[PDB]
Design a protein around this ligand. Structure first.
Ligand SMILES: [Cl-]
Ligand SMILES: [Cl-]
Length: 167
């Protein structure tokens, strides 16, 4: 239903993918997901893309999925078009799911991001707003937020928190 104020799961939202196609996020029902805001011109771009690609390579077979949302709200570090961003991600051998560029803060924020930020495990250390590029949310198979990791936490720190069976 796309209403951040009433939704109980990620699975109630839709989002436009980087190719311009609407995706119902209920396709992720049953899968553990990392949802993250990305940028191409951030100091931590390289380590985030490389480690997200590595996590996906090793855990896709267990059901790990990664949803990457480009966002230009942090130092204008995602200025390119969706087609440019798709090409950029392809240079990292990204095989996870790239979305069209969004806002993550303010009234124009994508509803999924409004929702994630208010979940009990979606709070940041110093409040809910997304602070910079490459915040990550871990989402369980039921579409609930389990943990949040900030811009300074490289993606491999999430590895520890994946289900034991993955390992
Ligand atoms: Cl996948
Ligand atoms: Cl914070």
């Amino acid at each position: 239903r796309d209403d951040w104020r009433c939704a109980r799961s990620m699975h109630e939202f839709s989002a436009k993918d980087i190719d311009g196609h609407m995706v119902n996020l209920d396709k992720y029902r049953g899968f553990v997901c990392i949802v993250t805001n990305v940028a191409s011109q951030x100091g931590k771009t390289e380590v985030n893309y490389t480690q997200l690609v590595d996590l996906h390579a090793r855990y896709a077979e267990c059901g790990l999925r990664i949803l990457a949302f480009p966002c230009n709200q942090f130092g204008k570090q995602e200025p390119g078009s969706n087609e440019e961003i798709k090409e950029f991600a392809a240079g990292y051998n990204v095989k996870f799911d790239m979305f069209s560029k969004i806002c993550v803060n303010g009234d124009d924020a994508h509803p999924l991001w409004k929702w994630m930020k208010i979940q009990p495990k979606g709070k940041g250390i110093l409040g809910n707003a997304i602070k910079w590029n490459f915040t990550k949310f871990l989402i369980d198979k039921n579409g609930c937020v389990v943990k949040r990791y900030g811009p300074m936490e490289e993606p491999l720190v999430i590895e520890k928190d994946l289900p034991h069976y993955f390992h």
